């Protein structure tokens, strides 16, 4: 035990010393007749110490437990794609011509990935494993590995570590390409048409990066929104593109500057059907995964109580406005960024001791209010807080029926913000900013139907749907720190 | 012949008088009970001169000719607005709607004496206004790319192009996963940084400058080391380097990576997975392509396979009455090599290395041996090509290939270094291969070529949504 981290030292050694000895420790191919996972799903109902001694099969993995037991015996634990199987490897079963066994096998240390030729059976106590005539190094692994419950900020920076290690981790993945995949096919069904727009503009914090030979300054996208809007105006009623966008700002659990992003664009869809539209397709992505609507989560980390979160629909709506009065014991009259009213709100924020915003802008003093009062209304379910007002919200559309609202809606999961979608605004005359971009601006111009569109954020989604309580957890290489 | 300057301003007039007047030209809902095309198939079928009078629907679309032309996801009707029909002033209610505006229409559906399939207004709602005139249908320079909606809504060819790119992505996303594949998403910035140029960017609460991804190859392969043996990423990379027909400083790309592979694997993959979609796309494994533009002939490019295989060194060798001795950055070499790149008339690159002197070599002889055919150039050197691994019997190669359509290249592959003491870079991946990568054969695809051959373009530019213009 305790190697001085010199196995490397040891292996790079054993390594060049097998090229002087003419021996290729990195072979070119080996050709393979079964994945692990079909080797256990052809050979799982064999009888305990039944060997098809007749059948000649090639496989391959990477070598994780080297147990020993006699000097004419030897075990491994053999794992590719997430699943293991025994090797039994017997001094009377290994073809000698090819070579010296107690020298073919002295040599595999744990990491190693080997390419056996064996045939399949079971151990008399019944562990399902390959039996090799002959076992060849494909690529060595240099470095010890970190045992079982090895594992820190290592997961992360190598993630290849906690992949090979933690049977979790390649779950947590694997759920995430799952959910992908769902809503893909969630909205390809419903007719809509996936398209790719520009990562870099010219117009949240952005990321600024230069073209060398083109001599201008370009940003990277804060989000799809614009262009898939020009291009309902262009006659693709139903346009979505998921993929990445870049924020830059601070970082934490739920922040990371580059994130996973779909948006949806719906052509001749109002506010109503976008919260029949989530409720149908969080309820059955949840269904989907879990079989039942209701999942567990540990809010406050793994060695905490779990809390459960029930995706029913419907969901709860909450009047943003009206909740903030009703709670406050207070009425906020319009317009919000008058003068009389900010102080009302500065006034609350102070007098139940919370963090004021500077610049004091109505629009950020409501969002901190809402933060603190409202978010955290429903952890047991996940819940719609809609009807934001226009000084909030300067592309939703005002509402139909109430004054300085619009209609617009955001559906939260334990305090966080996951969706967020209105019926968009089409009439260029009351675009404030247009009386964003030129190129935009334009567009309404030429004329976009009412439509109704989506905005989700794939990882916070993914994280509630994998218990983690960091946004690095369902990343796979998180920007971190040098 | 009128002025687009007053066309705006007298509509934005027009706008304003029809609030002023207590309606409201942006209406919020229309609940619609049909799309165009469901139109068009459910009553493709009526006689000539059959109404339906009895069934009255909501439909929408774009109005796009006065005389009505309804059009909605690429798709046109007739409307036949009747005195006899409408829901009582009808002048009044129609001489309002320009070309252009969205309108939304409580008809029946039917046929004109003509046989011209139609909807007939009792009512006719104007949705959303085209406050600017229109370009006249083969009326459309640069200002497609710039307003792509403007392309998508006049050329009927634009609108295919497009659906045929995200046809093309689906298609290998379903070949791929097939496979057993599995997507991942790995970093669009990395620390540090193929063999190009980088954008370059800060992060401000990091405070420090990150490189956006040239490529997709180094996490991936960091991957493998994970244990997902087959996985791949579709999207963006970012190269700072020159615009043309050919070239995009950002474009979509495919990398997957395929643990226990080969090379030759890879080439079994490629000839599959090209000939599938095209005959997918077509129908034949044959499509014409106007290589020297639409003014001119086509030709007939053939995706049966196999398709050829080219040794570039022994072509380059072969083409040239010249024996290239290694290795190639020997001095004596590079000059045989400089020799033949001004003597048949070339541009020299600077800095003049064997690995530069070669592509340029290979870019004039070879690259547009068969335009007829997709072909393959395969054992690049390894003075070339540092992350593929040693070819297995012959010395100084790799067993790497690469596709080439119409003189362009669309696939670049090659069976994986694996062995970390030959590779001559992240810390982070190096590192990883020490862990112990097995075989692995690799491959990258340019999606925006492959579109460009697939929709007879002869411009990147053209199979890109909005692609990066000079203001
Ligand atoms: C496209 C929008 C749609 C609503 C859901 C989501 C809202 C936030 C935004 C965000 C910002 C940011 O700076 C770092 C983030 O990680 C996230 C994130 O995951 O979700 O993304
Ligand atoms: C994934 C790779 C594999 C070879 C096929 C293709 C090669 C080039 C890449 C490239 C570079 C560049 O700086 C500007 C580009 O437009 C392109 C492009 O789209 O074609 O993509
Ligand atoms: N751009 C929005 C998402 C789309 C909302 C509806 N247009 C966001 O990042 O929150
Ligand atoms: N990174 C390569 C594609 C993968 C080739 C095989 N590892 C390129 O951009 O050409
Ligand atoms: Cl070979």
Redesign the pocket.
Known sequence: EVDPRLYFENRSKFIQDQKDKGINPYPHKFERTISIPEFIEKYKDLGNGEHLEDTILNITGRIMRVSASGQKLRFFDLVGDGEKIQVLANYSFHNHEKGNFAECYDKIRRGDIVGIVGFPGKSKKGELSIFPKETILLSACLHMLPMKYGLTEIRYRQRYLDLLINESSRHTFVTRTKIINFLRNFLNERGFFEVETPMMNLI?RPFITHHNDLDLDLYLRI?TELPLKMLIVGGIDKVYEIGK?F?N?GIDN????E?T?C?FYWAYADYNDLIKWSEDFFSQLVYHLFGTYKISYNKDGPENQPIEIDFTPPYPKVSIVEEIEKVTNTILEQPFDSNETIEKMINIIKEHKIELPNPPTAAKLLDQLASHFIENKYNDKPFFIVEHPQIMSPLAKYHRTKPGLTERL?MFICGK????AYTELNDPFKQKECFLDSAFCTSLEYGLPPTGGL??????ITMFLTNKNS?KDVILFPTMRP
């Open positions: 949240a989000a966008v924020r700002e739920t922040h990371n500057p994130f992003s948006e955001e913000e996951v969706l967020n905005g989700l954020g794939i990882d916070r946004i």
